[PDB]
Amino acid sequence: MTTDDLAFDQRHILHPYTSMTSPLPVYPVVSAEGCELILSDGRRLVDGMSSWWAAIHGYNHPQLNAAMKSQIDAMSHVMFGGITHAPAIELCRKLVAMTPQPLECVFLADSGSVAVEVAMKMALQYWQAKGEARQRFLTFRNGYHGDTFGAMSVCDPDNLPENLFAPAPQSRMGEWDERDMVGFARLMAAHRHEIAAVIIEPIVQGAGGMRMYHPEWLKRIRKICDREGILLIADEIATGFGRTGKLFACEHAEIAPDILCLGKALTGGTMTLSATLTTREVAETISNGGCFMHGPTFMGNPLACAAANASLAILESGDWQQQVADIEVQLREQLAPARDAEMVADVRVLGAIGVVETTHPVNMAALQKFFVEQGVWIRPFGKLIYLMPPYIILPQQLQRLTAAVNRAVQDETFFC
Amino acid sequence: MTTDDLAFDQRHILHPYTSMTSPLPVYPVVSAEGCELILSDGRRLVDGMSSWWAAIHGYNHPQLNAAMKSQIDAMSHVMFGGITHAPAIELCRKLVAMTPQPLECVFLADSGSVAVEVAMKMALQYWQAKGEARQRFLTFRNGYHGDTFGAMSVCDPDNLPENLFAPAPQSRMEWDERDMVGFARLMAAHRHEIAAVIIEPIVQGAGGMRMYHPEWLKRIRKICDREGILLIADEIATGFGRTGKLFACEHAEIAPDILCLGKALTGGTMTLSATLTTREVAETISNGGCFMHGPTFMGNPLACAAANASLAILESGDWQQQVADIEVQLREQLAPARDAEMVADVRVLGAIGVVETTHPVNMAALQKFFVEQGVWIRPFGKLIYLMPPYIILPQQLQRLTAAVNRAVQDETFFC
Numbered sequence: 001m002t003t004d005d006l007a008f009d010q011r012h013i014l015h016p017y018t019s020m021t022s023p024l025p026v027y028p029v030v031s032a033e034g035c036e037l038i039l040s041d042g043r044r045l046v047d048g049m050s051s052w053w054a055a056i057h058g059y060n061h062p063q064l065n066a067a068m069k070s071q072i073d074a075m076s077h078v079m080f081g082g083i084t085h086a087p088a089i090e091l092c093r094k095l096v097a098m099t100p101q102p103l104e105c106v107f108l109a110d111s112g113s114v115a116v117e118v119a120m121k122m123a124l125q126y127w128q129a130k131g132e133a134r135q136r137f138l139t140f141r142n143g144y145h146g147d148t149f150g151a152m153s154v155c156d157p158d159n160l161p162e163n164l165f166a167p168a169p170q171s172r173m174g175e176w177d178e179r180d181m182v183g184f185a186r187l188m189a190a191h192r193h194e195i196a197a198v199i200i201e202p203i204v205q206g207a208g209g210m211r212m213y214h215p216e217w218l219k220r221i222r223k224i225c226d227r228e229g230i231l232l233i234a235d236e237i238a239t240g241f242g243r244t245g246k247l248f249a250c251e252h253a254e255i256a257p258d259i260l261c262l263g264k265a266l267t268g269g270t271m272t273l274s275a276t277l278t279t280r281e282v283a284e285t286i287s288n289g290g291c292f293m294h295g296p297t298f299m300g301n302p303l304a305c306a307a308a309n310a311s312l313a314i315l316e317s318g319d320w321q322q323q324v325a326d327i328e329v330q331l332r333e334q335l336a337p338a339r340d341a342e343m344v345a346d347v348r349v350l351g352a353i354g355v356v357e358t359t360h361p362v363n364m365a366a367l368q369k370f371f372v373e374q375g376v377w378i379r380p381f382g383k384l385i386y387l388m389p390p391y392i393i394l395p396q397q398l399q400r401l402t403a404a405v406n407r408a409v410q411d412e413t414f415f416c
Numbered sequence: 417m418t419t420d421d422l423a424f425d426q427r428h429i430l431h432p433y434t435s436m437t438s439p440l441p442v443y444p445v446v447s448a449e450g451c452e453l454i455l456s457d458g459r460r461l462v463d464g465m466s467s468w469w470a471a472i473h474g475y476n477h478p479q480l481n482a483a484m485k486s487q488i489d490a491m492s493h494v495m496f497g498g499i500t501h502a503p504a505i506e507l508c509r510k511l512v513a514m515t516p517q518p519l520e521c522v523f524l525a526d527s528g529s530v531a532v533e534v535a536m537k538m539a540l541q542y543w544q545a546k547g548e549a550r551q552r553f554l555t556f557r558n559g560y561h562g563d564t565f566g567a568m569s570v571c572d573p574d575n576l577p578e579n580l581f582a583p584a585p586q587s588r589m590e591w592d593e594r595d596m597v598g599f600a601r602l603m604a605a606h607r608h609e610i611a612a613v614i615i616e617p618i619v620q621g622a623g624g625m626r627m628y629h630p631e632w633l634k635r636i637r638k639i640c641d642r643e644g645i646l647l648i649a650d651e652i653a654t655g656f657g658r659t660g661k662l663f664a665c666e667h668a669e670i671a672p673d674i675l676c677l678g679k680a681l682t683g684g685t686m687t688l689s690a691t692l693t694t695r696e697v698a699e700t701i702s703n704g705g706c707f708m709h710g711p712t713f714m715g716n717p718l719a720c721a722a723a724n725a726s727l728a729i730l731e732s733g734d735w736q737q738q739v740a741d742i743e744v745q746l747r748e749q750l751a752p753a754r755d756a757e758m759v760a761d762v763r764v765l766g767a768i769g770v771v772e773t774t775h776p777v778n779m780a781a782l783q784k785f786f787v788e789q790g791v792w793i794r795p796f797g798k799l800i801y802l803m804p805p806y807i808i809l810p811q812q813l814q815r816l817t818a819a820v821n822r823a824v825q826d827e828t829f830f831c
C-alpha cells in the first residue's frame with residue numbers, strides 16, 4: 001500500500017459505522033496468519049476480535065485454504081434455481097445434523113441480516129398461509145439483529161413498523177428472579193394474537209450490550225411460545241458454532257427454536273454466507289398457502305459452502321470445547337483485576353467472550369491507537385472493551401490482549 | 417453426487433423461489449468451464465443465463481481463478497472496521513473511475529438487496545440531516561429491487577410501507593411526452609414527501625425484461641434536479657456492459673445521485689455489492705454523525721480481488737464488440753419467433769435476448785426440454801430470455817436461440 005493509496009481510502013471509501021467527513025484512523029493490513037494480522041509496515045497484531053467474531057479458526061488456515069482452492073478448481077459459483085451441487089448438500093447435511101432435531105429445512109442466504117429477514121418472512125408467510133393476520137414481532141430490549149430494514153425493525157429502538165419490546169433479560173448467566181418475567185408476560189397477554197413470532201439472541205445479547213442472561217428465560221419463552229402457538233426465532237449469528245461454550249447457545253436451555261439464524265462463524269470468517277433453518281411444519285405451511293418468495297443471486301454459492309464445510313469439519317474434531325473452556329477460564333482470571341480499575345463498571349465472561357464494561361464511552365481512535373501500539377487488535381465500542389478471539393489462540397497471545405485491556409482501563413486517558 | 421444426495425437436496429434444502437412440498441426438478445452440476453455447465457452424468461450444457469446474469473466472463477476463467485487464489489494466500493478476509501486493504505482500495509479506485517464523475521464515495525456491501533437497502537438508508541438519512549421529513553420513494557411499475565424488506569417496499573406491488581408507483585415507462589427502447597404526466601402528476605402531489613426516485617435504468621429486468629426509451633432518464637434526472645430530490649439508479653442487473661454500454665445510465669448521458677451495483681461486479685464468482693453516492697450525499701449524511709451500516713464481511717478481501725480481476729478483464733474493451741455482435745446475433749436468430757403462435761413480442765438489447773409469451777410457461781417441462789437440447793435456460797412467467805456470457809461462441813449462441821425457437825412452436829410447454 002502507498003500513501004496515495006491511504007489518502008484514497010480516506011477520501012473515497014466509506015467504512016462501517018463511521019463518518020465520511022471524519023473517518024477514524026484505519027490500519028493498512030497486507031495479510032493475516034494464525035491469530036495475527038500483519039500490517040503494511042511489518043508490525044504483527046494479535047487479533048482479539050476474530051474479524052467481528054467470524055474467524056473462529058484464525059487466519060490462513062490450511063484446511064480452509066485447501067477447501068476454497070479445490071472448489072475454485074471445480075467452480076466458485078453456479079445458480080441454485082433448478083440446480084444443486086455437492087458443497088451445498090454437504091453443508092445442509094451438516095447443518096441439519098448438528099442442530100436440534102425439529103430443524104431440518106435449510107434456506108441458504110448470503111449475509112446475517114438477510115438470514116434474519118428470511119426468518120421474519122417465514123414467520124409472516126406462515127400465519128398468512130393459515131389465514132391469521134399476525135404481523136408484529138415480540139423481541140427484547142438490547143437486541144441486535146442486523147442493519148437491513150426488517151432487521152432494523154426488531155433492533156433496540158435506542159442502540160419503520162412498530163414491534164413489541166420486552167425488558168432486557170436481567171437475570172445473569174446468576175440467580176433466577178421470577179420478577180424479571182412480568183414485563184414479557186404482560187406484552188404477550190396484550191398481543192398474543194398479533195404476534196407472528198418471538199425473536200431473540202439466545203443467552204448472549206451481542207452488539208446491543210454483550211449481555212449474558214440466564215438460560216431459564218429460553219425455557220420460559222419456549223414454553224409460552226408453545227402455549228400460544230407462536231413461532232420462536234433464535235438469532236445465533238453471533239452465538240453459533242461454539243462461541244458461548246456450547247455448539248449452539250440454545251443448548252444451554254436445552255430447547256429448539258422454530259427458526260434458527262446462522263452466519264458469521266459459519267464459514268470460518270473466510271467470506272460471507274448465511275443460513276436460516278426452520279422446521280417441516282413451518283416450511284410446508286409456507287409452501288401451501290405456493291412458495292417462498294426469496295432467492296438471493298448467489299444463494300448456495302459453491303465456493304462459500306465449501307469453506308463453511310471445511311470450517312464445520314474442523315469443529316467435528318471436538319477440540320473447540322476444551323479450547324473454549326480454557327479460554328473462558330483464562331479470561332476470568334486475567335480480567336478479574338479490571339474489577340479494581342476506576343473506569344470499569346462490570347466484568348463478565350462466558351465461553352470465548354470476555355467483556356469489560358466501562359463507566360464512560362471509549363474514545364475509539366485513541367483507544368485503538370493504544371492497542372495497536374501494544375501489538376494487539378481490539379475494537380472497543382461504546383462502553384465495551386470486549387475480547388472474542390479465535391478458539392486456537394495461544395495462551396500468551398491471550399495474555400497480551402488481557403494485559404492491554406487492563407492497562408487501557410487504569411484511568412480516563414482513553415475515555416469519552 | 418449420489419441418489420441419496422439428491423433425495424436429501426429435495427427433502428431438506430429450499431431452492432430459490434419454489435416450494436418445499438413441491439420443488440421443481442433440479443439438475444446436479446459438478447463443475448463448469450467456459451460457457452458450459454457440466455452435469456453429474458457427463459452431459460454439458462450451454463449456459464444462456466450466466467448464472468442469473470453475473471457470469472459475464474463465463475466459468476473457470478484463469479484470470480479470475482488466479483486472483484482468488486492469490487488473495488486466499490494473503491487472506492480471504494479481515495474486518496473493515498478501522499482496517500483497510502489493497503483489494504478494496506483497488507476496487508474502489510476502479511469503481512470511482514469507471515462511473516460518472518459525481519459518484520466518488522464507495523460503500524461496499526455483500527449482496528444486491530443490501531446495496532439497495534443501503535441506498536434507501538442514504539436517501540433517508542440525507543433528508544433527516546437537513547431537517548426535512550421525506551420518507552417515501554417514487555419508483556415505477558414493473559420495478560424489481562431485491563427481496564429484503566426495504567427492497568420489497570419498492571418492488572411492483574403485483575409482481576409493507578406504501579411508496580408511490582408511477583406508471584411503467586411505455587416508450588420502447590419513439591419517445592412520447594404523455595408517458596410523463598403520471599410520473600409528473602405523482603411528483604406534483606408528493607414532491608416534498610419524496611426522499612428519492614429509484615428505478616432500473618433502461619432495462620427493467622425481473623419485473624418483465626422491459627426496454628424503455630432513454631429520454632425517460634433524461635427527464636427524471638431533470639425533474640429530480642428541479643425538486644432537489646435524489647436519483648437512485650439500480651444497476652445491479654444492467655451494470656458492466658450488459659445493455660451495450662458499461663453502465664446503462666450512459667444511454668441517457670446522466671448520472672444518478674446513488675448507483676447500486678452487484679451481480680456481474682465479481683464476474684459471477686461469488687457475492688459482493690456496491691452502492692456509490694456523491695460527496696454532497698456522503699458528507700450530508702455524516703453531518704446530521706455517521707452512516708449506520710456495516711455488514712460483517714464488508715469489503716471482504718477475497719470478493720474484492722475477484723471483482724478486481726473481473727473489472728480488469730473489462731478494461732481490455734473487448735466486451736463492446738462482443739456485446740455488439742451478440743446483440744446483432746440475437747436479433748437475427750429470434751426474429752422467426754415473431755411468427756410462432758405462443759409468442760407475443762421479441763425484444764433484444766445488448767446481450768439481453770427476450771421472447772415474451774402469450775401464456776405463462778411450465779418451467780419443469782420447459783427446463784427439461786432445454787436440458788435435453790444441451791442448453792441451460794431458465795424461463796420465467798411469460799419470459800424465455802437469454803442473458804449469456806459475453807465471450808460465448810456463435811455456435812453456442814445458435815443452440816440457445818434454436819432451442820428457444822423450438823420451445824415456442826406450440827402449447828406443449830405452456831401454462
Ligand SMILES: *Cc1c(COP(=O)(O)O)cnc(C)c1O
Nearest residue numbers: 112113144145146237238711712
Ligand atoms: C452479526 C449479526 C447480525 C447481522 O449480520 P451482518 O452480517 O452484519 O449483516 C444479526 N444478528 C446478530 C445477532 C449478529 O450478531
Ligand SMILES: *Cc1c(COP(=O)(O)O)cnc(C)c1O
Nearest residue numbers: 296297527528529561562652653
Ligand atoms: C438482482 C437484482 C437485485 C437484488 O439482488 P440479490 O443479489 O438477489 O439480493 C436488485 N435489483 C436489481 C435491479 C437486480 O437485478
Ligand SMILES: C[C@H](N)C(=O)CCCCCC(=O)O
Nearest residue numbers: 295296297433468622794796
Ligand atoms: C436472482 C434474483 N432474485 C433476481 O434478481 C432475478 C431473478 C428473478 C426471476 C425469477 C426466476 O428466475 O425464476
Ligand SMILES: C[C@H](N)C(=O)CCCCCC(=O)O
Nearest residue numbers: 017052207381497710711712
Ligand atoms: C459487524 C456487524 N455490523 C455486526 O453484526 C455487529 C458488530 C457491531 C459492533 C459495533 C462496533 O464494532 O463498533
Ligand code: NA
Nearest residue numbers: 096099100103
Ligand atoms: Na436439526
Ligand code: NA
Nearest residue numbers: 512515516519
Ligand atoms: Na465516479
